[PDB]
Amino acid sequence: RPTFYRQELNKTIWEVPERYQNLSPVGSGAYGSVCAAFDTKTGHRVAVKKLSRPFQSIIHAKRTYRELRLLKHMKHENVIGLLDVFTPARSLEEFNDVYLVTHLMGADLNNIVKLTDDHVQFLIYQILRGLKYIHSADIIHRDLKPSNLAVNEDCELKILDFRHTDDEMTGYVATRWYRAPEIMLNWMHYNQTVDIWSVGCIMAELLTGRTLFPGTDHIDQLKLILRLVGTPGAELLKKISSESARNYIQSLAQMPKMNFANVFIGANPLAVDLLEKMLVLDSDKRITAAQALAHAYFAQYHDPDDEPVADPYDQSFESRDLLIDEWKSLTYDEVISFVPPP
Ligand SMILES: Cc1ccc(OCC(=O)N2CC[NH+](C)CC2)cc1
Ligand SMILES: Cc1ccc(OCC(=O)N2CC[NH+](C)CC2)cc1
């Protein structure tokens, strides 16, 4: 066990191993607080997050366990990984606080977004390489958007930030602009094809410099989507499971899918083709991450021997009913069993 030292930064007590020096606040919120630091053991600049109220309810305790399980599993060049996890507690009985450590990330895609076609190829390639890995473990990201994609000075990219309130999704908000239409109004339960819809929205924005579907509310956004990709046809309508969805969509005048070469004027024809394959209304028919990596748009970067899959991820805990102290003990076990990367 390392020696810990204490300090107060912006009215919060931080107790961390001596290896972490020069802590300085970088943000806070309902989730907790985050500090940048220098890790003297690895020489990396790091982000240290202290969770707030990690075991305040059953929902909160299960969410703390879920985050730690997901971060401990991720081991891929284009996905955030866990450098360390610690608690100052010496026993389960005095266990209360959890701290998570990752590489300190600089810019996100929001800040970067002059993007040439070569830049778009490399950025979207890396997103899809990371998504092939995530999806191979049967993990769904569910919230892909530019602020959740970190990028360094050499255009290298990592996916991060794997529930949002109803108020957070209301109105003219980027928190909703990248969501697939089948989940935006809860017509359907999540499945991994929703992440490919988000990639299409992000890729379009990198090519044009503009949000693809900047709706002022859920209904406005659906109308923007259906104008581009068309109203549902006979084949898809037959498959729609929600009755209130069926009835509302049938109230809209029918519209054909637009010509994407006239929407994305001047773009690489291979980029237009890939966008037509991601932005399909019927989610069954969307291209997958593994299929997209082999599309000719990525000819300069595709290497089928260097696009790895993930170890299996057991999420049977998601359907388990446990008490707060049982979720807390499971979390404690995962803290003390952590093994750092080489
Ligand atoms: C060391 C570390 C580990 C995991 C982290 O997760 C990001 C996070 O907590 N949030 C980012 C997105 N905000 C909406 C809420 C806060 C952050 C730092
Ligand atoms: C056959 C082909 C290959 C790559 C392409 O990328 C777009 C491009 O190079 N442009 C530069 C000139 N701008 C006016 C529009 C964007 C476009 C066509």
Ligand SMILES: [Cl-]
């Ligand atoms: Cl130490």
Ligand SMILES: [Cl-]
């Ligand atoms: Cl990382």
Ligand SMILES: [Cl-]
């Ligand atoms: Cl503690």
Ligand SMILES: [Cl-]
């Ligand atoms: Cl597992």
